[PDB]
Amino acid sequence: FALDQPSQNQGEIIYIGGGAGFVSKTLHYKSKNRDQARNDSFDILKQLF
RNA sequence: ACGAGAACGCAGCACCAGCUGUCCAACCUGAAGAAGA
């Protein structure tokens, strides 16, 4: 209902634990472009499911 | 009727005394329960 999600506060956000998403598991989209990172993600996830 | 006969190379005696199989050394290195249940 709120989804405030405080942001830009000196980077104080950590996805600690699990059962949240597959983005925190695979690390290639922090050094690519949105279309390019999603293309690489599609290439690597074609082998899964 | 032998340069002969008779005659134990034998008796006593600890291969023993002292001496750390010790000294140094990490079972140690590298490694998400996620993911479309």
- The size of chain A, in residues, is 49
Contact A49, A37 (CB under 8 A): no
Name all protein residues with C-beta less than 7 A from any atom of nucleic acid chain B. Answer: A 15, 17-22, 24-25, 48-49
CA distance A28 to A31: 6
3-state secondary structure chain A: CCCCCCCCCCCCCCCCCCCCCCCCCCCCCCCCCHHHHHHHHHHHHCCCC
The residue behind tokens 């949240």 is A20
Protein-contacted positions of strand B (CB under 7 Å): 32-37
Resolution (angstroms) stands at 2.8
Identity of the residue numbered A18: G
CA atom of A22 to C1′ atom of B35, Å:
7
Method of determination is: cryo-EM
For chain A, how big is the Rg over CA atoms in Å?
Answer: 14
Distance A15 CA to B19 C1' (A): 69
